[model samples]
Target: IEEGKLVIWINGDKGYNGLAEVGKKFEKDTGIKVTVEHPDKLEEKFPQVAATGDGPDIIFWAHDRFGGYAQSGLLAEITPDKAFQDKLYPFTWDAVRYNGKLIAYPIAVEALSLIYNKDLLPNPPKTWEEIPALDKELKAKGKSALMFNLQEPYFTWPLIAADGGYAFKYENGKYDIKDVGVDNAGAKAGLTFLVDLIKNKHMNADTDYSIAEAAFNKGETAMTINGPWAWSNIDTSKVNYGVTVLPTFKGQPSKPFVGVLSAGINAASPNKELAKEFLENYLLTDEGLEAVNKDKPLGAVALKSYEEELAKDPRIAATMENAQKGEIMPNIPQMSAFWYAVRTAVINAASGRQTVDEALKDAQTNAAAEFVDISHKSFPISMPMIEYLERFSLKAKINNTTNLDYSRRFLEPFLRGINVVYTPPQSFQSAPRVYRVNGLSRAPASSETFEHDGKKVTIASYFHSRNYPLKFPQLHCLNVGSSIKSILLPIELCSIE
Candidate 1:
């Protein structure tokens, strides 16, 4: 390895300061300097900067992000020696490897678990069925038993995956993006269980992360599904809390998503060798891990024997236990689709906008669409309006009152700035109303007028004279030059430019 200076980037003051302390020690022992940077928006900026060969030699971030970086060739393949590999927890390596290559050094692991107020609830429920009864018990005191971001997939996945549901199939050490299992029968049953909780008033559909955290901190809720990251706030609130494994749903286990934090060497960095050396020699060492844990204390450390030390703290032990039960979060970029789709499904089902089966089906459809690669070329500027409406079964009801809203939403944007010629049914009903389309208006034709035969005529009377019954009372209008009066045209008779 080269003896060049190395630069590392980490977000947050604690992590930056912690690495800086280790950097000083590295610099003192070997005559090489190390610069630690605490950058704003590190996640968003790192990729763009690294692509230009101006990023740090090493970056500290979650392992979930490494798949994208590795795919983009921004991360160098890291092959740690057997001694270093022997020191790390086995499952921690699963997060850092992508496409059969190790891309980073696992630092810590974090996963969601059951956190409860010991004062309010002496014993946490071990099964989902026990929760609603507990909720009833607490309701007598104007309190509830459990709380979590109701619609968040990250917090809800334990329920969603309780019956063997998964975001994607992991086969032969690769994520099969085409195999999305979120809509499977098992997943639907799991999500349905959650909806039942909402129906029974055991959980509130409107609750979000902030509301859950606030309720837990105030002791208004006896238990919450949260991660180690939330410990600081809970501790600050002085709540006597106990950490334990999440309750099982039905007869199956509740498996949360396990995420790992790690450090990776930048492929574009000139000091790649030095960065790798620093991570292997200094960052992965006992002294280095201890310094990091002292400052950041990221729940479950990945170091083998070191975990025993952290497990002494019962809170951390519960987190580690939950992590063991959870599935490693999929690191593929395709996982992005799963996050959005599942959240939408959970919200729809829990809010009663859609049935559980329908919601997950829609989620599967949307996620599959997003997972497939499509051409980035721009779509054709114009779609035949009438034909487009027909394709969506909007043709038969285009003039229907309720369908008017659909037309406005779908057509207004497409028709804006286009010149359309509209001809009246009667030859004597004044000249065709022609103007550049601005948009559709709810204003009825009976409320608008035009100058015809040197007489001000209401649009309804004009069409009445032609014996044409207005099917769509609403009008599509646009301004003509400096005219204050908008040129209102009946959508039925308008011809496209």
Candidate 2:
């Protein structure tokens, strides 16, 4: 027997174990001596190995990091021809491609979805609005509605998209960062809704991924949003589990980032040609896919064969359904900046320190500024405050017998609450003597009001000064005579002057 050996380096224990099983099977079928080297930390080992110019013939890595390695000429470009390309999903091929050259073979794919306890929540929320009610119900039952990682911003991407907002727009082979639409009406509305939930204690951000999964396992949480990689560790028997495609907002579904695990030959390796052949015959073959499917059941990039197997596992099927709507996680070098900006925005928005629009806008601006060629400039324009008010009118009505009756008839349903936006009309006037409520002392009464839109509203009495004077300051009388009547009128009309 001639002396021959093939060495492969894997980053993690799971990859080492998984690949070893596959390697043994491959070597048994084909006359090849395969040696597997597992490293606890690749960051320390990778550079050392690369410096010596004597590294493993094959290496395993997540495809999201492929761009860095490929650009540095650390990976070999392997195109097994068009015949092999048609067998795999286009996304798999696209993920490993750098500058029009295929650099890797995809071994696995992963994505996130809304995972829920079927026993607790018979049907998971189909919309964002439903989450608050679910949270309320769970809280009443001494349970949590959901748990999430507030520290990680990528987790909120799906939620943001579900609210009809996007971080950036990719069009015609270009990315636009300056066209920040995060502060758009839809995005703001979505973020506002989330903030209300968090403030109300309906959603808990304190729980990390592990704690969240444990809560779900213990029936403490009704639902959670997480990725496919968590399946192996999750407790499946705690409740009946069901997977569904993430909910949609205004006809657009939440688009989660799709992570693909591809295989690439070492560009500098002496066995580059042999590695490419091995990748083609094993990485893209039906048998190779089956080996991957057995280890990671979420399915491979070869969708056709995996679809049948995925159907057998509901989780895999659900993941596949979500993958159908998934957007490939960007491999652009500028994506690092994009992630940081987006994460900061998401954290600020979630924490209530910034509005969703503000967060997204800042992120877009910062990311665009980081990538000068990305055209991050937004169209400069401003709409007058009155224009906004016109769409949703801003009017004050004196609750006299004449206008009060008209206001009750016209604005009851449309009126959310009495918002006193007092910009003292610029007519020549002395300092207006503002009045206080009957029960309250001499405090600014104009700003004292209640939130009437969500939850519930209450009625109270308030008074205003009848005359602006140095002496004999007349105090107008006000009464909470009828709660029903007070409820019916706007705060402006209810004010006494």
Candidate 3:
């Protein structure tokens, strides 16, 4: 055993266990003394050790919590010249890239997909609208169609994007904070559809990941939206199941956030070159790829051949499809604010605390405001009122405005009625211009008197304009009220004039 051997520290139990297994295999294959440490109190102890500049040579963990460390200059940039760069996935490698330097090498990438019970649904629907019909069919048979964790924004975000919405946009190969697509009309409609499903009992809100998995294993729920992490706990024997990429809505596919767990070297470590060499050889090789794939069913960002082979597995193929549509979780420091705002708005909308439009507006406003503060510039300048109206109409046309048939049916009937006052039954002649009285003349019209239904009534009415219009090609306006000289009783009534 060497005196100064390579030491690796992992945060989670799963990573620790998998790496320990890999460590034993690595030592047997090559007589290298690799020390693997799994701390029970890593969150507290690791940072304390890192502060004193006495950390491990290599750290294996997800990049979800490494933004601070990277910014504080505590992490190493793992740019193994140019050879290592070519072997990595573009999106995965770009995730840990800070200021033109590659900071980590990804081991595995996990993403969300549509996982359903094959017994209940032999084939998963490939479009968003098809989901409702399937749900209706299942409900007819007294079965639940789908289940979701509505409280979590992770599940809701993909659905939002599928309907042509985005939390943030990347433009010119950089994150464009000006592009806040949450308030997009398609996004609101998509969220409304999701809420309708739950409200109408097409899905269950109470069924979280644990409950959904249990129900799925017991053959209770037909479909669910989940990720690769769920593969281990699911019961494969109770029911045949299938995994598929999340369906698209109106040509926009569901895009999940790809979470990459990488092996990053500490910049402050004395064995930087050795750590880089070990990572390049061990983490990017066939054996390492196989070890990672075996430990977790997640697809790899490295090992193109192995990844292609893994994709042949139906479940892994679905994850690959999902990865193809994935938006790499942003590695920027400000991304935390963007995620928090987006997630808060999404959860609030799903919980019915706010309408989707209101929630998305809040999210967009907050994110855009923060971005403006950070960048020191105003963006997405609002157009003039006329220009805005024109642009809005143009957008409406492009979005298929004729498809508004569904919404127009609700309000059209109520707006077509004519305004009129009541007439007595005896004097109810079917004339276009006539008024009759019934109740108000006989009562004082006090609140109590009106409440008790006093018969005093007065009627005022007007002729339909179309009925009295002249047949002549060129005609002048005429007042027919002067022609009808009936009993000239100047009754003080509610006059139509």
Candidate 4:
């Protein structure tokens, strides 16, 4: 492989800094000069960057992102050789498979487990059955049992999996996108447990990730279901803590969803051969895995033998133990819809807004309805004002009574700006020095006129800009103050895109 400068886009998080160390080492060893960047929300930006062929050769990211990138023809395939295949936590090989191709190399792994404060519990409970008694004890002491992101479906999946629930059934070799599994009996089982926890166990349905983490750090809760990222926040000097697997539920193992952090070659990458060797082969080696995992230790690497290497640190060992009972996160594009389906169920059931069964059922129905979800950006700009209101559900009554005339004055400029932005055929430059709004009233009812195709088009009171002699759009007006005084509301017609 002809190596110039090799660039890798790692996660935007500091928790994944181990890879950066490895990148520096690789540069030193090979003289290829490695450049690594932590791009925030890399998953969202990857597709766009990959499509344009304007990025690093490698992307180190979660395996769940593999399917979408692969399907978009943005990933370069690399089959795991025997050296690569003989690995740790073998779930990742399946995760990187897209249309029967290994689209990425599964590196380190992650699992959601119980991160608990040792001071609060002498012995960690092995089952949910044993938790309530401790919970009761904690409650008696004026503290709480456990806390986690109540609305996060990923965090809630362990409960669902405890009841044998799954998002999309893997049939033969592909994810059945048409068959959503969140409303099934297994999902109902998980959702029911959550509702009961919120209603009876004193767990808060409104508890979010930040709230739960702070509460755990403050000694407010004994335990939390979280990943390794929260470890940095628990001040070890003040409170001793440890990690453990999610305990069994109803005599069955509670299976958290396992995620693989992997390195994938961009199809746009100019250094495929170099990446295949560096990431797939060298990184799987004993010396190579050591450089990566030793820095931060995000569970076991892809090699099973590496378990012995990481197990020296009990923290990583605990994560690996929990991962033993975990299910692999689906990497299919359809998994996107699955998250929305279960999140709605989790939130609805947790808040007592719906029964577990009813909520999952409704979420399942909603999932089907949104199978072909369209972005709000797709809304046509040429659509009428009434349709805009209906499309965005933007019908709020502005009281012309409270401040008397503040509502129209505020809404008119705002809505006009939005119209210019959302309206199709956007032109930003070459507008009039200033555009003017004329012949409009305070709290004006809908009545408008336009010169479309040189024809006088009469319409309702809408928004337009005369920043320059340019685009034609409807303009709205508001004559204001104690006596509806006429004011010139000229706006710099910005497309705001």
Candidate 5:
């Protein structure tokens, strides 16, 4: 490693993109070389890049994805001083800890809150009943008490949880992957309320973020469900809005997911020593946090005591408090399957295409389908085993999922091109089945069975005899899978189930 050399990474979504002055200051003060790069598709593309030994020294991202990377041995564990850990929101530390070790520096805790127009409601409601029989009054004024992007699961899920709906139950200090609660009594209660809000003219399926924002800014929508960043769109002068915890649903409090964006060091970096020092001394300190916050209020830092000062700011206090009551977003990789189920289920229910019960069942069915056919053919168990075997783990993971068991009739559903799991309710809705071609792509055509590493394997392939028009030159190869395997490019060249 060269002297004073350090490299920092930005997500493909452009998180804290480019680091601005923070990168320069670190180098100026520490005499370290710093380079920031936002690699294309870095989020999902990270593992492959790091495995080959050409990746950044540091990455800043949400704590949820950190678990998989850490498990793959691609992230370094940080043993910060006792004082450092003490300063953090004790509960929030769980977000970054994996296998009883800290894998990232926790920062920026966020949660949902109610943002209501004071001129119309005057006071925030403390209960669901307080929604007020303002329907006739607001109808005459062509306004509504509340509205939100009904399609977005982030906000919609909390409404479900308010009445005890949950996707997975956290027990024994861990989430039990097999026990799902998407369609439980609590969820039905909350979603039923949501549907009533729509049926009663409080909101509609057509409302998106923009529509909701415009409605609130113009005093047309008296209340909106949103996060800390929502204030940017509304002109504060015209909108005398106040923030508060979401109203309790049927006597139960609404519990949202607490999101934590954090900092991590690359396990593959050559400049580990210098990178560790910078992260520990500069980025986690109060002065360093201020510099990072210069560009935008990136939510509350994990420094719990110092962060109480953040709660003093009226706008953030609600979310901060709500977070104390909210569930920490689970960091397990299986959560990938959980999110897809809930998100799609919410869309189905809110769109009126399916009843709330039907939507929850659909979620469960889709989850089971993906994991149902989950299996991986044998791969090289030699020096190349790491990547190939790891992907099989993902293949099974995609299939093992859960949704609401509402006693409704069942039906079900990423294409890594290797294997694909998707929603196939009512013989697949809106989304068409994955159109895959294997004959010309590489995998053997019509392989009811095959062999890999002296192990019998089965693979699905599209013969494409009629579909192949010879528009492009064909390789006509069956051995390419071997070449791909030699490199141990787990996801790089395999179909995703």
Candidate 6:
């Protein structure tokens, strides 16, 4: 094993990226060799790369992803001292914790806020409802008001969450994945506001991130909902901007998702003790944080010691204030599915393709369908596996003849320990006729037959009478018992019945 050497992996080239000075000091004070590398695709590659036990000792990234790494047994748990914990904002600690244990050191935090052009509109709207009136006024002057990426749920989550919408229920410092509230009444209210804005022609549903950014940069729009990461990208010379918290939604304070940037020690690293020392005794200190913040201004410093100093930058100060009022973005892996479902719901409601209630209902259906946990021997009913079946209905329609391979592949994951015996409302007097397939031609019907009386009827004929076509004649035996039974049927048809 290499002695006194610590290697760190980071993604970006700014902010926390320039840790060479800190590294130099750590190496000087302690006889350890410190190396930091900007690896490509750090987010996607780190899990695979670190699993080999040959990756960097320290991994720097946004705290949202550490949950998966911790679940995978890749991160080393680091309980910061009470003194150290008390020095930082408590909310930031949530992002670094997994399963009620702190696993990383928080560096900074960021969240979406209302960034408005002070020159175009001197005062920002107090509430989202006021934006419509502000837009009416701006239109007469050949300018617009409050343009954000309507398609991006990240930017619009405040509108949804402010009125009680949430991806998952949080209680006792833990997220209850089973208690999905995305389509609840509170969520519906939030989305209804957005739908009204689009239907009333007060805002354009087509305004995406790039379009909103370009227009706002040109001083053509009064405001846009964005995060601190966008500060550097904004054309400051062209427009004078001020950062503030998002407007209230239905009389409730809008809360954006707060993301924290943090660093964690790899459990695979041999130099775990030295890595811990480098973080707590070096990187997390006031001087170390300042050194990194100097490389590129942090969205919001996490340490309370620098509050007065960081407040000097109004943009940074406003971002900190906004983050203080926001909810920490859930670091669970389920967030991926939640984001997709919410984005789809936003698009559906905004475009008028689905009513707000229907769209939100589908969001719950879609998100819950993807929340399957294969780690457990039996799928939990509390997680709403029925939603998976509901969502599957659209893909595998009733009476539709789908192949055995595709059907089994889709159902295998969710069917374990689930009661799948469902009888159709219309009882069948005879079972569907099973046929064997020899190449492209259909062989004779199997000797097995179900009779209601002295007559026999084919299952395909019954479906065909009801206007459903039998696409394939291949009979897939379920092989439920040791011997092959006479009840051979198409998987999809059997699933529907």
Which digits, one per residue and each the tens of the lDDT, describe model 5 over residues 1-497? Answer: 22338877755332243254566778888778677777665656677777776677887776877887898788988777787778777766888999999998887787778899888888767876667476556767778778777766778877788777776678987887777788788888888777777767666877887788778888887888887656655545368888888888888778887788777788877677777777766666676666655444556777765576666787777877787667778888766566777777877677788899998887766544444322443442122112332353323222112111221121111112333212222322345233232212232223334565796643322223333222112211122233344211112123323
Could you give the candidate ranking by TM-score, starting with the highest? 4, 1, 5, 6, 3, 2
Error of 2 at 423 (Å): 59
Tell me each candidate's TM-score.
Answer: 0.67, 0.62, 0.63, 0.68, 0.66, 0.65
Q: Which ten residues in a row have the lowest lDDT in candidate 1?
A: 371-380
The alpha-carbon root-mean-square deviation between model 1 and the true structure, to one decimal in Å, is 13.0
Q: For each candidate in the order shown, give its overall lDDT on alpha carbons.
A: 0.78, 0.59, 0.61, 0.67, 0.64, 0.72
Q: lDDT by residue for model 1 over 1-497, one digit each (tens)?
A: 22357888886623566678889888898867999887876855788888876788888887877788888788999878878788898778978989889999998888889999999899889998789899999999999999998856889998789888888898996778889989998888889888999999999998998899999999999999987767767877999999999999877779888888889888877777778778878877778877876666677878877776767898888887887787888888766567878888999899998998889988998878742234323333333334344555355544444445546667667656777666666756578655676766555576566786799977767777777866655544333332444666666666554
> Candidate 6 versus the native: TM-score?
0.65
Model 3 bad stretches (over 4 Å)? 1-16, 26-69, 139-142, 235-238, 266-278, 369-497
- In angstroms, the error of model 4 at 444 is 38
Of 4 and 5, the candidate ahead on lDDT is 4
Tell me the tens digit of each residue's lDDT in model 2 across 1-497.
11235667755423355566666776786767566786755634654565465567777665656676677677777867777776677767777777888878776677677888887888788877677787888889899788766565556666666656665577788556555445567666656666677778887545565677777777788887776555544544446666678766556677776777666666667767667666677655666656654544444345455544556766767777787875767665555566677777767777778877778778777767643433424333322222322345336322222222233333333433323222222342533222222221111123223453563322222222232111111211122223333222223322211
Model 2 poorest ten-residue lDDT run:
468-477
Model 1 alpha-carbon drift over 4 Å, by segment: 1-57, 199-201, 370-375, 378-497
Q: Which ranking of candidates, highest lDDT first? A: 1, 6, 4, 5, 3, 2
Candidate with top TM-score is 4
Listed per candidate, the RMSD to the true structure in angstroms reads 13.0, 22.3, 22.5, 10.8, 13.9, 12.6
Reference-based lDDT, residue 448, model 6: 27
- Backbone clash pairs in model 3 (N, Cα, C under 3 Å; residues 3+ apart or in different chains), count: 6
lDDT of 3 by residue, 96-134 (tens): 777777777776677788888877888888887788889
Clashes per candidate, residues 3 or more apart or on different chains: 0, 5, 6, 21, 19, 2
What's the TM for model 2?
Answer: 0.62
lDDT of 4 by residue, 187-297 (tens): 687677778777886688899987898898888888888876556667542767878878888777877888888888888777787787677556766777776555545
RMSD score of candidate 2 (Å): 22.3
Question: Candidate 4: how large is its RMSD?
Answer: 10.8
